[PDB]
From a paper:
We determined the crystal structures of p18mAUG1 and p18mAUG2 expressed in E. coli. The p18mAUG2 structure was solved by multi-wavelength anomalous diffraction (MAD) using crystals of Se-Met substituted protein. In both structures, the asymmetric unit (ASU) comprises three copies of the p18m monomer. The structural superposition of all six copies, three from the p18mAUG1 structure and three from the p18mAUG2 structure, have an RMSD of <0.25 Å for all pairwise alignments overall Cα atom positions. There is no additional density for residues 249 to 259 that constitute the additional N-terminal sequence difference between AUG1 and [name]. Therefore, we consider both structures to be identical, and define p18m as residues M259-N355 (p18mAUG2) and representing the minimal domain required for CNC activity. The co-expression results show that regions of [name] required for CNC comprise residues M249-N355 in p18mAUG1 or M259-N355 in p18mAUG2 and imply that the nucleic acid chaperone domain of [name] is not required for CNC. Inspection of the p18m crystal structures revealed three monomers in the ASU, each forming two dimer interfaces. Dimer-1 involves a largely hydrophobic interaction between the exposed surfaces of α1 and α3 on two opposing monomers whereas the Dimer-2 interaction is through the side chains of residues exposed on the exterior of α4 and α5. The application of this model gave a much-improved best fit that comprised p18m monomers in a tightly associating monomer-dimer equilibrium, KD(1-2) of 0.73 µM, together with a weakly associating dimer-tetramer equilibrium, KD(2-4) of 43.2 µM.
Excessive replication of [name] [name] retrotransposons is regulated by Copy Number Control, a process requiring the p22/p18 protein produced from a sub-genomic transcript initiated within [name] [name]. To minimize genomic damage, p22/p18 interrupts virus-like particle function by interaction with [name]. Thus, p22 is identical to the C-terminal half of [name]-p49 and is processed at the C-terminus by PR to generate a mature protein p18, that is identical to the C-terminal half of mature capsid [name]-p4525,27. The structure comprises an all α-helical domain related to that observed in the CA-[name] of the yeast Ty3 retrotransposon, ARC proteins, and orthoretroviruses.
Author numbering:
A (entry chain B): 261 to 352
B (entry chain A): 261 to 351
Write the structure that this text describes.
């Protein structure tokens, strides 16, 4: 698409996760955005990506943005492992 | 700042210009964001940058997002020359 990169950036900058969408969908959604932008030459590294993910991460997931200060060199895969583990406990 | 690039992206993705802020401030604001992101490795070329500027460009500046289809290879400097010319005539 001619307007692909712009639409991926706007989606990435306005992520809103609370626990309604399954973690499976939300992960692949963000992972695809980062991969699509990187294929077009826009590299969003782990540091900048994690910051944008934790931004808007609300509900019972708000705390991940608080502990992030101790978490530098964090990876996107690690950040989603945290979100997944919370979703598992949200189903039961 | 440790959170500079992320804050630059959110600002670039939620630009809202109507004609209240002077074009001088709005131009240097966006131009600095693009330069900072390119220096940090987040390459935002003219095509994607202009698209993001025209997004949220509302008020009497809406029509620039309509003519953008005939305007390919339009540089950021060219897009602001348009915005400037509308701002000068607005007062």
């Amino acid at each position: 698409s001619d307007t692909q990169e712009a639409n991926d950036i706007v989606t990435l900058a306005n992520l809103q996760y609370n626990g309604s969408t399954p973690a499976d969908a939300f992960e692949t959604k963000v992972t695809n955005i980062i991969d699509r932008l990187n294929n077009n030459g826009i590299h969003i590294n782990n540091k900048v990506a994690c910051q944008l993910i934790m931004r808007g991460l609300s509900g019972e997931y708000k705390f991940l943005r608080y502990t992030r200060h101790r978490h530098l060199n964090m990876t996107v895969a690690e950040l989603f492992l945290d979100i997944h583990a919370i979703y598992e406990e949200q189903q039961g």
